[PDB]
Amino acid sequence: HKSEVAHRFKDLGEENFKALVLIAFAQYLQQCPFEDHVKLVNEVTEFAKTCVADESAENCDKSLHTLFGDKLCTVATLRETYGEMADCCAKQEPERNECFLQHKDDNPNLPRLVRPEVDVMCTAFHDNEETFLKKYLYEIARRHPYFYAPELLFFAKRYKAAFTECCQAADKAACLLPKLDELRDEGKASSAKQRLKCASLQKFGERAFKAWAVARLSQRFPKAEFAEVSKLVTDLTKVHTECCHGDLLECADDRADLAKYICENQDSISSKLKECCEKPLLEKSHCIAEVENDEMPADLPSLAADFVESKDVCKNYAEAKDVFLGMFLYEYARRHPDYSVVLLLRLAKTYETTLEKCCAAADPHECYAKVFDEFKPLVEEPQNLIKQNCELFEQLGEYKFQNALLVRYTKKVPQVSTPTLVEVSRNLGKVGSKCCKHPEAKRMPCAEDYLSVVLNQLCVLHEKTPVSDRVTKCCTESLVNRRPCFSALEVDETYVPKEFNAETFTFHADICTLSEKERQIKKQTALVELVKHKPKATKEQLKAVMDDFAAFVEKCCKADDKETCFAEEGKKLVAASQAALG
Ligand SMILES: Cc1cn([C@H]2C[C@H](N=[N+]=[N-])[C@@H](CO)O2)c(=O)[nH]c1=O
Ligand SMILES: Cc1cn([C@H]2C[C@H](N=[N+]=[N-])[C@@H](CO)O2)c(=O)[nH]c1=O
Ligand SMILES: CCCCCCCCCCCCCC(=O)O
Ligand SMILES: CCCCCCCCCCCCCC(=O)O
Ligand SMILES: CCCCCCCCCCCCCC(=O)O
Ligand SMILES: CCCCCCCCCCCCCC(=O)O
Ligand SMILES: CCCCCCCCCCCCCC(=O)O
Ligand SMILES: CCCCCCCCCCCCCC(=O)O
Ligand SMILES: CCCCCCCCCCCCCC(=O)O
């Protein structure tokens, strides 16, 4: 408007305003103390208020970036603490803002943030709700300088809502701790997703991204016209290019403009944007991003007509291959919400691979008159797995099932950090329950969304601590082949069973006194180690020793003494195993 500051304050509101400014500065000045950021926020906020009362007061005409940069440069110890970053204060705005971007650190050498006791958290919440929430928001923000601010804000309110509900409950911990875990996990998945897209836009390219967006937007807005979808994909692409550069304000405006365009064209995109569009800026785009799939028109012909029989097909394909394959993808995508984008892309690639060789023959219509046959095996696969796993996830519960993955993966690539094997296994497990719950129509898309992050996380580690090239092969394979690659790893047969060591299996009674998350992650570390020492063991074998061990501990937690039991009735089990498996 006449003043940017004013305008952002007016529609964001004072409370949200204060919290975003805090997250902003917390992400650059990651080293300064909370108390300092509060002075800052309050200052900036008093100024904002100045521009709201008189939208023409001194300096209110300045742009946010400018103002932001000016405040960053007033920090007395900028150069002493951030050193080179302080040099940014010498450039002329555009360059300055760009300079600040590139100096923001991502590996803040800061201590892991620990979860204090429920009683103290609850007490802290109660005594001073704002300092408590804003303090932790500041803590999460300075350790994650790239986590999109608004989204972090959105998480805070969930944290606030969980304390609010739990701290005044009967069994606080049992109420609170699980919700805090659902937020930690969820919070990590979100961080991972946004870095993955920005990475993909880098690797795979702007085109591949678009292909991905068309598939995704068509499943969500099946009723819209290819032209309409296509318009949204071009915009969606920019939004994410700019956003991936890292400027919070630019990124925010792009998401806002798009969300507004979508709401002003509702009846041309979806009939599911009712709610979201009534919401205020902040929540609007976010809301839209999680909207449900509109229903597809019952009418809808079939792909056969326009993509196989129809004359002009090779003609349409040569005039605009990209737009053409875009329409294929679009038409298929909107008819199949239950497919994972990536699956939709193999289909699209395959179709392309056929028209490329087929429109080169003397009579194509014959060459490609059976493409849809090549599609069946490609679709059946991801489906059949989803079934094999989700069904198995029944016989056994999450934990007992994570123990199946655990063994299966340790035997594929046994030369991998045992604690990385435990994390990945457990993570796959959670993916199994977060999804297998959904109906046979949201499964594949869910898995795709969660398996991806888990897979990238596992590649990032493998990238930093390489070991097995097979994984490397999968980690450097194509966007569309990553998963199948992993799903095709066979048990490794070159493995040299790990040197024995009874210590790795030496246990004590200190475990009859540990929470689930504890007991588990230990019964699982031995299980993994047990496979690396005798990978030639079978499921009947391990499903046996897993019992001779489990029900063994219950016998030491049922004995007057323990230490002896956990060594006496132990070792007795070790030998009874180092024999029954050799
Ligand atoms: C990245 C991220 C982490 N967290 C969680 C994970 C962190 N612990 N660990 N590991 C915890 C630190 O308070 O917050 C969150 O709530 N939101 C987020 O966006
Ligand atoms: C669609 C989607 C996007 N994101 C990313 C993309 C958003 N940025 N942009 N553009 C970012 C917003 O926090 O989160 C996400 O974390 N989960 C999702 O489901
Ligand atoms: C905008 C974010 C506001 C966050 C307020 C967070 C309060 C978090 C307590 C977190 C305890 C986490 C324990 C853990 O991750 O292991
Ligand atoms: C002086 C510091 C000013 C910081 C202002 C931050 C404003 C953030 C607005 C974010 C709007 C997001 C809209 C959306 O995601 O759809
Ligand atoms: C203003 C944004 C409205 C977005 C509605 C999005 C439905 C999105 C499925 C999106 C996958 C998006 C990836 C990205 O945005 O970078
Ligand atoms: C208006 C935009 C139309 C875009 C049409 C895109 C068609 C993309 C086919 C992409 C195949 C990608 C295969 C791969 O990335 O490995
Ligand atoms: C020790 C490192 C192990 C890394 C394991 C990566 C495993 C990826 C598995 C994907 C499995 C899909 C299974 C299924 O669909 O039924
Ligand atoms: C404990 C792990 C449970 C895993 C269940 C995995 C279901 C995976 C479905 C994968 C579909 C992949 C589709 C694709 O890659 O194109
Ligand atoms: C040298 C002998 C090493 C034995 C290692 C045994 C590891 C057993 C893990 C058992 C996990 C059982 C889980 C369950 O029963 O629900």
Curated annotation (Swiss-Prot):
Site (Aspirin-acetylated lysine): 197
Annotated positions for site Not glycated: 2, 18, 39, 62, 71, 91, 104, 134, 157, 172, 179, 188, 193, 203, 210, 238, 260, 272, 284, 357, 370, 387, 400, 412, 430, 434, 464, 473, 498, 517, 522, 536, 539, 555, 558, 562, 572
Modified residues (Phosphothreonine): 81, 418, 420
Effect of residue 175 to F: In Hawkes bay
Residue numbers bearing the Phosphoserine modification: 3, 56, 63, 271, 417, 487
Residues with N6-succinyllysine modification: 203, 434, 517, 562
Pfam families cross-referenced by the UniProt entry: Serum_albumin
UniProt keyword annotations, A-Z: Calcium, Cleavage on pair of basic residues, Copper, Disease variant, Disulfide bond, Glycation, Glycoprotein, Lipid-binding, Metal-binding, Methylation, Phosphoprotein, Repeat, Secreted, Signal, Zinc
Binding site for Zn(2+): 65, 245, 247
Modified residues (N6-methyllysine): 532
Glycosylation sites: 10, 49, 135, 160, 197, 223, 231, 274, 279, 311, 315-316, 321, 349, 376, 411, 437, 442, 492, 523, 532, 534, 543, 571
Record CDD domains: ALBUMIN (cd00015)
InterPro entries, alphabetized: ALB/AFP/VDB, Serum_albumin-like, Serum_albumin/AFP/Afamin, Serum_albumin_CS, Serum_albumin_N
Assembly description: Interacts with FCGRT; this interaction regulates ALB homeostasis. Interacts with TASOR. In plasma, occurs in a covalently-linked complex with chromophore-bound alpha-1-microglobulin with molar ratio 1:2 and 1:1; this interaction does not prevent fatty acid binding to ALB.
PANTHER family: ALBUMIN, SERUM ALBUMIN-RELATED
Family: Belongs to the ALB/AFP/VDB family.
Protein name (database record): Albumin
Gene: ALB
